[PDB]
Amino acid sequence: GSGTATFGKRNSTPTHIRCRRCGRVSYNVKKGYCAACGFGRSRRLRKYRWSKKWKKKKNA
Amino acid sequence: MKPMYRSRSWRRKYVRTPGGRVVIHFERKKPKIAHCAMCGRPLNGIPRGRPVEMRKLPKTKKRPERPMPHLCPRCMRKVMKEQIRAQL
Amino acid sequence: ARNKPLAKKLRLAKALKQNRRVPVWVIVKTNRRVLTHPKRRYWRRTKLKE
Amino acid sequence: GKSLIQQRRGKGSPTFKSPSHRFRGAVKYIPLNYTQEKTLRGVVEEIMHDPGRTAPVARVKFENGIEKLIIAPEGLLVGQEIYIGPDAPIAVGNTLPLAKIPEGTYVYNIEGIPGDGGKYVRAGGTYALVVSREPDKVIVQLPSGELKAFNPMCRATIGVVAGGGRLEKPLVKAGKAYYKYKARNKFWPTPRGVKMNAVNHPFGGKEHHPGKPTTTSRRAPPGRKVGHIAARRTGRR
RNA sequence: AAUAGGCGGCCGUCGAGGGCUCGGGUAGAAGACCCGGUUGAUAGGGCGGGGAUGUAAGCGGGAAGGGUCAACCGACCCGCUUAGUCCGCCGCCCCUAAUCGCCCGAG
RNA sequence: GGGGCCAAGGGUGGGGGUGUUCACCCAUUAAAGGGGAACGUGAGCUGGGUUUAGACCGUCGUGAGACAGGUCGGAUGCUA
RNA sequence: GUAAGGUCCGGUGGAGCCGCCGGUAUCGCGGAUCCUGCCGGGAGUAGCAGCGUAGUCGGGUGAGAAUCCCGACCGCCGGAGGGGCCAGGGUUCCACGGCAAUGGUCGUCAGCCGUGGGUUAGUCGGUCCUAACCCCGCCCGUAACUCGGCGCGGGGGAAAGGGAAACGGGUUUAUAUUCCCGUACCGCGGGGGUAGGUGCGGCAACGCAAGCCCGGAGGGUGACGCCUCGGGGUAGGCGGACCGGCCGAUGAGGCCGGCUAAGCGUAUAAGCCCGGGGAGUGCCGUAAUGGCGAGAACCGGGUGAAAGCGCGAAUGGCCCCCCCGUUAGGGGGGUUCCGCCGAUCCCUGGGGCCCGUGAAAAGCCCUCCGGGAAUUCCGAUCCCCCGCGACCGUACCGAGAACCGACACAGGUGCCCCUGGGUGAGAAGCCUAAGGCGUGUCGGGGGAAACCCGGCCGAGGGAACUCGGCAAACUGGCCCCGUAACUUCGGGAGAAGGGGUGCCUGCGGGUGCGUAACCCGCAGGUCGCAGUGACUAGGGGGGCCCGACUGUUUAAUAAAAACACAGGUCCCAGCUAGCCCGAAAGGGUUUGUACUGGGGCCGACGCCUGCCCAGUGCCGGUAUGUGAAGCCCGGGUACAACCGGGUGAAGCACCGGUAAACGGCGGGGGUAACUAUAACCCUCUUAAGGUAGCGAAAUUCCUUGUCGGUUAAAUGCCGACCUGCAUGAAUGGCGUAACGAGGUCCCCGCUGUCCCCGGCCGGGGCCCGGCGAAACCUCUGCCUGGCGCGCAUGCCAGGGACC
RNA sequence: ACCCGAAACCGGUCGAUCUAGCCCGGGGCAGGGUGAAGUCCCUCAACCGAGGGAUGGAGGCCCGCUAGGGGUGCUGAUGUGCAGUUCGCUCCCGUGACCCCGGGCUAGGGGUGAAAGGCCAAUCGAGGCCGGAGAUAGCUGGUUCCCGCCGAAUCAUCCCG
RNA sequence: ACCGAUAGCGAACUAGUACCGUGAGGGAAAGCUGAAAAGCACCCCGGGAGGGGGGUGAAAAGAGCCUGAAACCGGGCGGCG
RNA sequence: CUCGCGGGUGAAGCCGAAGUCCGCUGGAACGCGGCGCCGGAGAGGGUGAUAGCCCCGUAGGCGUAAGCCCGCAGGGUCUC
RNA sequence: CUAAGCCGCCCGGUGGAUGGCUCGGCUCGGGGCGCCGACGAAGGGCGUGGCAAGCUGCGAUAAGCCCCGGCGAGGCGCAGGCAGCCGUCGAACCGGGGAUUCCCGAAUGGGACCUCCCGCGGCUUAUGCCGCACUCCGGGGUUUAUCCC
Ligand SMILES: [Zn+2]
Ligand SMILES: [Zn+2]
Q1: Which residues are CB-neighbours of A35 under 8 A, at least 6 positions away?
Q2: Which ligand ends up closest to the CA of A54?
Q3: Fewer CB near the last or first residue (10 Å), C or N of chain A?
Q4: Short-list C36, C12, C11, CA closest to C26
Q5: D42 close to D67: Cβ distance less than 8 angstroms
Q6: Which residues face A27 on adjacent strands?
Q7: Which residues pair with A16 in a beta bridge?
Q8: How far is the CA of D189 from the C1' of G778 (A)?
Q9: Measured between alpha carbons, how far is residue D138 from residues A9, D4, D147 in Å?
């Protein structure tokens, strides 16, 4: 196992869904927080200086 | 069948309609009879049924017409005698 | 799938409306310069982002 | 290396937490302000089996209207009347201050300090012996064989805890053990450090044998206290 | 067989000799080889021979017994019955198809 | 029978224990010869021994472990 | 021009470009298993088989048909390849018009392309309640936080848990409990009348319409585990009669249809209960357990489920017949019983098991407490009628092509819920009805081979094969008889071994009203090689090692002797404890309390577990020595730094306990008597010198030890010896019934494993028509003897060779 | 610092749809066999006691292609596969320490582990993502136009050399 | 005194777009007709795609559009065979 | 401080000279030869070729609401 | 007059190099301008065109609406089409000021397994408006509740 057969058990609830704040499909639905912006867990946006995606968004 | 009806809390009956089709009817299991407060013995004069069936009936058709309808007659006599003896 | 929240249904509707061919009169207006757009999708092959 | 089971238990993960929602509730005495200088009578309503208690429990409805859960003593009768207070008769099921219990009596559910709620001698089939009664302390012999001094105003109940003698019957079946320990979420089955890996246990290794004496100092740090901890002696005496 | 042979015959300076197509295995992975091709028994068909199983369907009679000890039912047996069925074997009979047609070829 | 010469056309087989080559043994036989070919031959086969990862015993080491010491298990790709 | 290169001539092209001097630079291509793009040989080759081998004949369409459509015939699944419906998918749904591309071939076809359309709710689900659990506010910690956290207050948390209410007929190309028709129900509010406020019948259990509004308390229900059994009922099925149709010979016989929802009204069964009654040399009762002066037999009576019955409801659905039929329509009949089997589907009761105890809350009903009006008045849980019931989902697949795995993937997800007839114990195997399909999708040809993979058989011998009986074969179901060593007395056990088995004609027995239905025996006749005739369907026995047993393990080379287990035993801890997480706050064990919590080792069961505390470790004491800072004293410094001494905790030194703590258990001096043997036996190096057991062993080097058995032959196996290189008592010793896809040896039987291989079946291989790649590739490619980096197609001398 | 290549180390964050463990709520396992405790009955003798038949349904019991689960041998098919773990026959468990589903918790020197260094999204003797980072190496490979002139060395001392 | 579409920012253009991973996050390819569409009216063949004539344009530069190298493939020509 | 006034600056923006003169090639002159002009403008771009004078623009100048800045004048406060 | 095959030239196919071009990049002395938000920001979701998919712009007044000023005959975006409409009562376009500005989002009256739902009070006839998060500051009331304005 561990391969093709195990990949067929992905019919359960998705781990991440659309986020009401950032608009990305990264909202952890079971834990109730976003893995992209931190919505539902932090008042301020989730930004890290080792991450370049928020700069990619604006071509900065 | 639907997953909600796949549960055994529903009772399933196979019924054939006048048009010849075969359908499955579902309904909820009836509650158990009321029991005595003290000795836990079955009561009388209290019909079994769901809340809708209870509300379908009038007041006098849901409990016997005697004091302390929540106790069996033996416990009722016990309590009444004890109370009067204590009073006197 | 049978039971859908309204917002997800609306997003699916928007994607469905998005998926369509380029108008022939638009092709004529651009003089065969604009033929296709990046948002074309095949349901069995290209899945929605959500 | 990796962590030990005893270390992992300290973090309170669901693998190690007590499922304290299947049980019947906490068993503690009525607040001391009710018991002191006033005796109350209660009626036993029902006797039940508490999933994790090692002893049966009982419900008591008191004259003042308080419903409480108590550890039922051996021989308790449903519908029986019990008393809690300083002026209660000496009998099984009654709770008395330790200063009012004649010497040589068996008691259970002894308060460590007056009003705490009872801490000592609550397992099934256990009792403690009241040895002496002094103005400053009451000496009681506990199941472990220790003579402990209690404040005279500590509250205790007369009798013995029901359900004694369990260990007479063997469990026989690994499945019986499985259900027994699952009822309490106690770690079972258990591994052996000698057959663990060296990364996992101090005794681990390919050769199944401890490489060091198994008596560990009391000053050893966490992650090292395994085997015989601070053992004065070992072996068969 | 680079000394790449000998002989008889036919043809050439339109034309001998071949190929595809045709009915078949003394043959066979494709090719190739072999018989026959109206100058005919190559295959099919008809009849006969010789074989392999083992006595067909149908009918008549009997049948342990049952049944009103009647009518009627009955596994099975006997006679017509060396039967019936089949034959990747053989002989005789041109009855059917081996026809029409196309192509290379030395000078 | 013992020793030796010419002679390589042919044969030189079957079984028991052992992974065995070898060696030993059994009944036959004229004989049951020794070797080379990448210790011929795994894009021919088998995988018993050997040489990973699991595990047991003995010995050595405080220990992790080790043993040209035993012991059980352990994959063999191909369209020329 | 030695050259890096330059310049001229002839074509294409349509817009910029160069000589010389002096400066600047991402300034010069064959490699880097270099990077990006394109294109080659492999190649018109492999693949388009294996797990379900499926098509054929007429007709139609269309330019074009093996592949599309209709009819017939032959087939496949038929406990799913059929029916219904989640999650996931997201328009794949429906009609029409099409074939540039996609579809393993073709295509008029489509889950493809283009154009239009499709999802209708008071009753179905979310919405409401709460469970495990999560979040926010205060509070404490943190340098700090979006970080960690106990306690309070608040909120969330199930589309299969709890939880108000609807069924049937018809309708669309595509929606139906949603749309139309018929007939109902629940929630809220309103308008009349009435019961009651102020009423009755029963000894009783109880029967009743049995006041209204607000707040509170109590009780019940909601509300529950596993195993097993009785009783009642319903789906579904079987047989017979009789109305219609089809087939059949317009014989016998066979097949099809003979149907009935919610909602209203209505009763008993079991349990429980009430009144009378007054028992034992007992009585009554169940499938079984059982009940009785604490009230049994026996009489009456109350309350109590699933169902059935009546309306709903025959005009509806179904079957049939007739007049019309260019087309479009219109009418007339049946739709009735009996007897059986019977659920895994419902209702209701017994009984048994737990060192296992198998949820909460909203909601609903009843009673009781106080409070508020009501008299030409108040007023229903009763009867009749009227008004309002919001928001979101609702199409379709639901999988061998609509999901995940890059795919129209033989995997996984969903075997998630259900299964007519015959044989049969059976939801097995086989055949078949309904339903579905010919799309587990390339077709055609053929003694058309060799060879490969699946299958069948095989004379004589029967393991001679092989590391090893790997693979295959033998036995096989049911009934009767009959069953060993050993044993933990339960087992071993279906040990082993032997006999029978079909069909037909009748009798007898069980339960039964029944010649209904299901089982159990007896007698006779008879056929074959074979009667569990297909299908289904154990081969067996005797030794040894390991592990007691069921169970778990390296997903993807190890399933085992490894792990676990019940049992044994040791250690810490009396609670603010013991052990543990953390930076802290606080926390786990803890809704706990020695029959407990935590920490090791061995590992069912039987008999037992010997010696050693010097070594290491742990524990207790610590008189005495040493022992840091701090403090004190003297010196020194106009003050300090600095030097000397005193006090001196823990820890070490020191003393004692402790081996089911780590681990060890030799050597000689010797030994004498008989020759070896040396056995008892006495003594020293350091703590003691291996006890009971077992032994060439999963431990033994010499080693294939020696002796005996097994074979004709024995590096094997079993028993024994002891010389144990280098066995041993809880890192346990020895033994052990039952158990094992564990390793290992032998015997009967069986067989193509082999002597020695030979036939046959289906699928590939081969040819033809189509779609069509990849691994790989310095260029090329004959040999003998040599040279060479020491094993060359390419070099040297020779040989040979048409493509 | 002429250009390229490491295994690795550190920081912050993301994952328990696979899989490991535990909590809450649910669905499922044809058919047959054996026969534990319990409760009894009959025939004769009766000082003892012998002989025979019933009922009852327990079990980490037995057979079993029910469903479902596992993966022993063929070291079979396939092995540029149907498939980056599959298929067939054979085989094992199949009322329990059983199988499965929805809602939850445990997160990287950490979790979980009937203990195999196993599992933690095809990755596990320390996961993935991004950043430190163009890390470093005495080790391997590469380094592009022509002609002209002269033209070596692998040997002495010292270095964890 | 920078680059001139494999260069220059990843993006000269419907570019942090399409796409890959549950996630954190990773992240392309793709410019040019002509001066003016004057973008081929009509005829024959073909089911269609398109082919041959004939027209437009200075030049098809014919939209698969400025130039059109090499690799590779097909035909003719010259040489060997 | 501005009931008031003046000025500066300040959005879009406005003005701004000189050939479309003959001949040749050309599909089309920005080209070649000839004849001219402006220039505080021979920077750069487009226009059917390479254009000081075809067009934009440059050389040089102008205007602008609100806002901002400075000042005049009047009314106050405060400091030595 | 040799079949396959090899090299060379010509033509043709395949491909996209080279050359020329550039509304895009990169770098830079000097110059200008530098914060937006509860009067609800930035990022995002969904809508919006006659034919309209992407981008761009806008928000149910939805490639737009109104007022002052500049320009002066065309205009309806990238984007070369059909049809139609707007403009001399001055459009398009440009600078300034206004109006509209769905939903989520610090998101705030309470909730999010789905950027959608459920609430409580005054005004209003009703339509329909205005208030209600937490942690505080300066005040008032009383119920002393951190309860209300
Ligand atoms: Zn987010
Ligand atoms: Zn009672």
Answers
A1: A16, A26, A27, A28
A2: 1
A3: N
A4: C36
A5: no
A6: A17, A34
A7: A28
A8: 66
A9: 66, 42, 10
Q: Which residues are in reach of strand F, CB within 7 A?
A: D 195, 198, 204-209, 211-212
Report the C-alpha gap between D120 and D139 in whole angstroms: 14
The Cα–Cα gap between B87 and D149 comes to 49
Q: Is the shortest CB-to-strand distance from A35 to strand H under 7 Å?
A: yes
- Chain A, nearest residue to C48 by Cα: A25
Residues 9-38 of B with CB under 7 A from strand H: 9
Query: What is the residue-wise DSSP string for D102-128?
Result: PTT-EEESB-SSTTS---BS-STT--E
Alpha carbon dihedral D148, D150, D154, D156, in 10-degree steps, equals 20
C-beta of residue A18 within 8 angstroms of C-beta of residue A27: yes
The count of C-alpha atoms lying within 13 angstroms of the C-alpha of D144, restricted to the half-sphere facing its C-beta, is 6
What CA dihedral angle connects D67, D71, D72 and D74, to 10 degrees?
A: -170
With touching defined as 3+ CB pairs under 8 A, do chains D and C touch?
no
Q: Name the 3-class secondary structure at D204.
A: coil
Decide if C49 touches A, using CB distance below 8 A: yes
CA D43 / ligand 2 centre spacing (Å):
18
Neighbouring residues of D134: CB distance < 8 A, sequence distance ≥ 6 = D152
Given a contact cutoff of 8 angstroms between Cβ atoms, the answer to whether D73 and D162 are in contact is yes
Beta carbons within 8 Å of A54's beta carbon, 6+ residues apart: A47
Buried b / exposed e over B47-78, threshold 16 CB at 10 Å, is: eeeeeeeeeeeeeeebeeeeeebebbeebbee
Buried-exposed string D22-48: b where 16+ CB fall within 10 A, e elsewhere: ebeeebebbeeebbeeebbebebeeee
| Beta strands at D147-150 and D138-141: parallel, antiparallel or unpaired | antiparallel
Report d(CA A51, CA A39) in Å as an integer. Answer: 17
Neighbours of D84 (CB within 10 A): 24
Q: In the 3-class helix/strand/coil scheme, how is chain A assigned residue by residue?
A: CCCCCHHHHCCCCCCEEECCCCCCEEEECCCCEECCCCCCCCCCCCCCCCCCHHHHHHCC
Q: How many CB atoms lie within 10 A of CB A44?
A: 7
Tokens 């962590």 sit on residue:
D3
